[PDB]
């Protein structure tokens, strides 16, 4: 399928144990997609002070369109040293590995895969 319905656990930035997906734009997009397929991906809502507490390159989920079955359609965009790889809509959050942190909420998305 070109899209997959996922329910992503929303994590508090200070709880995150693994603060990024790797060391290159290509690696972090690859690992993010793998962790999204495996159900091991969390979401941190971006506010003042969040991104400096996470590791670059960053992987964002961005709104791809204006929401089937309550699932916002999203795509992945990576960022390294202020340059983005991908073009999309509003940021829903930054993706991180999930390793058992307790979420505050879930974010239903339709991931362009």
From Swiss-Prot:
It is found in: Host cytoplasm. Residues 2-113 form the CoV Nsp1 globular domain. Residues 1-113 are annotated as: Disordered. Inhibits host translation by associating with the open head conformation of the 40S subunit. The C-terminus binds to and obstructs ribosomal mRNA entry tunnel. Thereby inhibits antiviral response triggered by innate immunity or interferons. The nsp1-40S ribosome complex further induces an endonucleolytic cleavage near the 5'UTR of host mRNAs, targeting them for degradation. This inhibits the integrated stress response (ISR) in the infected cell by preventing EIF2S1/eIF2-alpha phosphorylation upstream of stress granule formation and depletes host G3BP1. This is Host translation inhibitor nsp1. It comes from Severe acute respiratory syndrome coronavirus 2 (2019-nCoV). The chain holds residues 11 to 125 of 7096 of the full protein.
């Amino acid at each position: 399928k070109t899209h997959v319905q996922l329910s992503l656990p929303v994590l508090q930035v200070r709880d995150v144990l693994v603060r990024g997906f790797g060391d290159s734009v290509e690696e972090v997009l690859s690992e993010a997609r793998q962790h999204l397929k495996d159900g091991t991906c969390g979401l941190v809502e971006v506010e003042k002070g969040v991104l400096p507490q996470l590791e670059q390159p960053y992987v964002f989920i961005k709104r791809s369109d204006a929401a089937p079955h309550g699932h916002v359609m999203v795509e992945l965009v990576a960022e390294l040293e202020g340059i983005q790889y991908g073009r999309s809509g509003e940021t829903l959050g930054v993706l991180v590995p999930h390793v058992g942190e307790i979420p505050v909420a879930y974010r239903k998305v339709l991931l362009r895969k």
